[PDB]
Amino acid sequence: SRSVWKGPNIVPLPIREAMTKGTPIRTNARAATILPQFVGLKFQIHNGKEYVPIEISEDMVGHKLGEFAPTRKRFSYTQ
Amino acid sequence: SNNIKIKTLDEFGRSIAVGKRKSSTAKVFVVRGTGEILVNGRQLNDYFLKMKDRESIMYPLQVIESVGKYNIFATTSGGGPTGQAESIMHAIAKALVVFNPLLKSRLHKAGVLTRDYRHVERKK
Amino acid sequence: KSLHKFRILARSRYDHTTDIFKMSSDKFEHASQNARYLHDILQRLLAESKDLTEDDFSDVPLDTRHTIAKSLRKKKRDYEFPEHWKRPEDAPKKKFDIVDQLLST
Amino acid sequence: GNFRFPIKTKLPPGFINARILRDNFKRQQFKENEILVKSLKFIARNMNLPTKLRLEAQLKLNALPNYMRSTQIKNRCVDSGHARFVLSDFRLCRYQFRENALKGNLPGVKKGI
Amino acid sequence: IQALEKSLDELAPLMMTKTFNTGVAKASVIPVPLNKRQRNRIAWNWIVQSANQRVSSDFAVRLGEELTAIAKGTSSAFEKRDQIHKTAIAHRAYIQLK
Amino acid sequence: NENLDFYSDFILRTGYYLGIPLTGPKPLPTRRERWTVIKSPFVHAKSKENFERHTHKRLIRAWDTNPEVLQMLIAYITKHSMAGVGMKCNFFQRSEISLDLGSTSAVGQKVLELLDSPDFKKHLEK
Amino acid sequence: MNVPKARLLKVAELSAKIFDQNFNPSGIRTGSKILNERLKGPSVASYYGNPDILK
Amino acid sequence: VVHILGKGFKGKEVIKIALASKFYGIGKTTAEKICSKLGLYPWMRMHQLSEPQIMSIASELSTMTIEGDARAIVKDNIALKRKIGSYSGMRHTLHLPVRGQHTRNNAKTARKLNKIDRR
Amino acid sequence: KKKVTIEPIKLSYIYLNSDIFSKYISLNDMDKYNNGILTNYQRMLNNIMPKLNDHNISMNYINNINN
Amino acid sequence: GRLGRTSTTNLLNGTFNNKKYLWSNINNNYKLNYIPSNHNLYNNSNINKNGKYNIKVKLNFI
RNA sequence: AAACUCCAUAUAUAUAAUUUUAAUUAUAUAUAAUUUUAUAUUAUUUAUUAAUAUAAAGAAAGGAAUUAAGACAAAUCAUAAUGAUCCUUAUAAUAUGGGUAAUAGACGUGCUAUAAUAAAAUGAUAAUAAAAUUAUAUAAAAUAUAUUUAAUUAUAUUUAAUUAAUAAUAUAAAACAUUUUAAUUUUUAAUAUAUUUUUUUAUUAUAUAUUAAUAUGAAUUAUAAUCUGAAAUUCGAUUAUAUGAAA
Ligand SMILES: [K+]
Ligand SMILES: [K+]
Ligand SMILES: [K+]
Ligand SMILES: [K+]
Ligand SMILES: [K+]
Ligand SMILES: [K+]
Ligand SMILES: [Mg+2]
Ligand SMILES: [Mg+2]
Ligand SMILES: [Mg+2]
Ligand SMILES: [Mg+2]
Ligand SMILES: [Mg+2]
Ligand SMILES: [Mg+2]
Ligand SMILES: [Mg+2]
Ligand SMILES: [Mg+2]
Ligand SMILES: [Mg+2]
Ligand SMILES: [Mg+2]
Ligand SMILES: [Mg+2]
Ligand SMILES: [Mg+2]
Ligand SMILES: [Mg+2]
């Protein structure tokens, strides 16, 4: 849990183009902190193999992009 | 020739001996007195809370039946209460031989003139 | 009064028990540079301690808490043999040796 | 003609392997950029500065290449390159330490009690 | 202290039968003599078990009460001793004596 | 210890002729370093070998000597030093309270440069 | 403990000035630690030895 | 038996300890503040309380977030995790550890308690 | 970054230093033990030194010390 | 080593002890705390058509 | 091979201007034991002897290292190194992210616990250690916040001394004393009572449930804050409030 006094984990992202054009933002920065500006924008977040499409809501601010792109498949046994 | 010189009382009538047990060491000053004991400047009951430790210190004086005939000023460092109490015991026995060398055999027979060699052994 | 102000301003660098004021510096790359730096600080501290026109810090008592902490980390053998226990009459008395007495003449 | 790393670096004088080369490159670039990283970290962590300058420094820190990261330096055996159980007193792995120790190569090392 | 030693000397069994796995056939129950250190262990364990049935929260109090009752004649561990001696008297012929 | 003691004895002889009162060599506590290794190269972490290194220490003190003579001692014993012996020298110079002519960090400079760069000045604008 | 805090703060400030120390009475995080840490670059960059060996 | 807000207490129970034991959301520190506010001495027991004092405890307890209200806050925070599709929300739904614990072994308690409608 | 001197010391036999002896065999005597140890090669490695009596030499040394 | 399976041949000739330490108060010393002082042991390996082979020589100087 | 040896232990000498102090120490050298002596008894191959006891002398009671051979063609080509064979725009090299942390069952090894011969608090002229560590550092005291008089614990601020027998990590802990402790009506309270008064006795009230989980236990989980780092989402550590499973 990053200390609040340090601020957000800001990463270089192309937000201006996604706000003037509406294009999805494809990114591997799973550590990135979802800033309040991101709300409404569409992100494609790498999960190690694919890019998961996700739109950001107001209940996602503060969390990190990686939290919404699971990297493992649900476990199953050959019962 | 030999390297042993007769031990004698010092200028103040005190017999000084050193004793060791485990990691503890004790330097005692034995003089003729009335049974007063000081451990590191503190009363015996203050420094040693366990009565068994106090009894160990008294045992050498009990063997020669001279518990009320000497004043002991014991200084000890290292280890814990048991090591220090028995290191003082060993040192008093070694210091009492100067006052009467004829009692060494009785002290040896009681086992107070033998240095205990047991120490913490690194497991092998 | 100036000695008291000097000791108050030194803080942890003064040990009341020993009366020693010790300060070290390795900030610079050359020892000569560091020697001057400590010298300059000493002159500055002495000037402030000797300028009692505004404040003398006489109300402020000397704080020794730093020294107390250091003392607790060391062992203190501050006990001496009681003087009223000494028995000078039990000390061995030098014996008369004619040979040594005769070999000296 | 085609160096594998963005900046030209001199080779270590002894045993060489790909992992040693990668670790050595990171070590050299950490030294070249150590002051830069400390200066940006200062600006980003100094609460007396405005938040905008603090966030700008944090962004610049996130954009530095991985070969400038102190936490990516890993001590490896200078004789074999193995990166597990490396004694820092000799910069050798346990096995190479034992072999060198028994050959009399370590200045004051002898067999224990 | 004299009361404790008298109680330990009266409660401890003099002998105890032990099973020896001698031979492929059934083991033999032969009476064996006990030394004083072994006798005190048997009697002390009986005392502790009897003491731990008392109401006091403090073991010292329960032990004190148990020792007081034993010094006054009343103890349930004397039955154990009689049953160990009965078995030994039965197997007296099983003894080897060489 | 062997070279250490021999070299220490030589220093005492050098000082005597130089007129330097010397004390020692006082033996200081020996430091012991220990390393435990597994004898096998791959597995078998149940058999472990022990290794150790002992640092032997000696202290020689100099008294009532002028600085120039003390430097001659250090120079001579340096010229004729033995293998595997290290030497640390603490010099004590008593001085007057007030002397005549006496006896900025890299990071700070870069911070000022960075805070003047356009990527930072563009924000500091008030 | 009975010494007024104002008096003890005046001593702390003056002492810090004489000894060229940073006086931060409020306690705000200033990053001074970062500015004082030692540079480990030279030691880290020599791990594998001197590269300018005769070959 | 002393009844405060439905909860039953044995007479000998110490008030500050009993309150932090039977009431959800009240711990040791919170229980001590309630007793200090009502003038109950540190080690007062339930049987000593009078009816006016039992009503005062219920009043102070009714102005706090405890029992259903406190439990609802936890159930709603867990539901929000599932609604946003966070990794943690899925763990709660799958009855798996949500705090990084390994699952190759152990993880038995998370299998019994981790759920969106957490008790 | 210090003055350096090199002192080569010549040994006239290869069996006076264990290190030199091992290197010679390993690097120069391969044609003698690559098809098994030649019966002549082994014989040479057994007549290098006369079989000195260690006991009398040891006792001669101890007598000199006593003298 | 291999000089298709590794083979080891051992040649042993002479003394591997020192009697100066038994008949006299002189005491032996262990080099590196595991090697006797009289004994000097060294190993050298090389590569042939088959591969690596080691030459292990041990001399006892008294 | 044993041993000789080195270590430990006991003692002696040397060194330290006894403020780098632990001289009750440090570390170089040497000495000492594989103990010795007599005495009675019991056996013997009875002798110039063993097993015992007894008195006497002594500090004397413990360890180490290494290998001689051979077997498992036992482990390792992943510490590094070699032959053969295979890849050579890829089976080599670099970057970003992910994984190695998945989870039905099973197994090994640990930790914590299931309460009264045992757990929890408190103990400042500070009960009592050893062995280590600090230039790719160890961090004192003080102040601020959590937070309350203070202490305690955690973090921040600041960075004293020491690169070390000097200063720091670091006032060892258990022990011991006092207080408290569910199950337990074995308690607590109200009156009265006492030559048990930190307590006794008497009369009332103090629960019901209950083979059971408490003021035992601390898994699980919510929320907030902190630490390291460029970065803590998968996937780290710490603190506070709340949660309080199995046993
Ligand atoms: K509660
Ligand atoms: K996991
Ligand atoms: K398991
Ligand atoms: K990973
Ligand atoms: K318990
Ligand atoms: K995380
Ligand atoms: Mg400083
Ligand atoms: Mg402290
Ligand atoms: Mg210290
Ligand atoms: Mg690392
Ligand atoms: Mg002293
Ligand atoms: Mg793994
Ligand atoms: Mg507990
Ligand atoms: Mg103390
Ligand atoms: Mg502090
Ligand atoms: Mg204490
Ligand atoms: Mg305690
Ligand atoms: Mg609890
Ligand atoms: Mg249950």
Numbering used by the authors:
A (entry chain S): 9 to 87
B (entry chain I): 140 to 263
C (entry chain Y): 214 to 318
D (entry chain N): 2 to 114
E (entry chain G): 150 to 247
F (entry chain J): 52 to 154, 180 to 202
G (entry chain X): 1 to 55
H (entry chain M): 2 to 120
Describing publication, verbatim:
The mitoribosome is essential for the intra-organellar translation of the 13 mtDNA encoded OXPHOS subunits in humans, directly supporting the formation of Complexes I, III, IV and V. Indeed, without intra-organellar translation, mitochondrial respiration cannot occur. METTL17 is a highly conserved mitochondrial matrix protein that has recently been linked to mitochondrial translation. Using comparative sequence analysis, mutagenesis, biochemistry and cryoelectron microscopy we show that METTL17 binds to the mitoribosomal small subunit during late assembly and harbors a previously unrecognized [Fe4S4]2+ cluster required for its stability. We then grouped particles from the two datasets and resolved the structures of the SSU, SSU-METTL17, and SSU-mtIF3 at an overall resolution of 2.3 Å, 2.6 Å, and 2.8 Å, respectively.
To further clarify the putative role of METTL17, we also formed a preinitiation complex by incubating the METTL17-containing SSU with a recombinant mtIF3 (the second dataset). A cryo-EM density map was then calculated, and we identified a new class containing a subset of 53,922 particles that was processed with a signal subtraction, followed by 3D classification using the mask for the mtIF3 - binding site. The map features the complex SSU-mtIF3, where the initiation factor occupies a position on the SSU that is similar to the human counterpart 77 and mutually exclusive with METTL17, as a superposition of the two states shows clashes between the factors. Comparison with structural studies of earlier assembly intermediate states 56 suggests that METTL17 can be accommodated on the SSU in the presence of RBFA, and we also show that METTL17 is replaced by the initiation factor mtIF3.
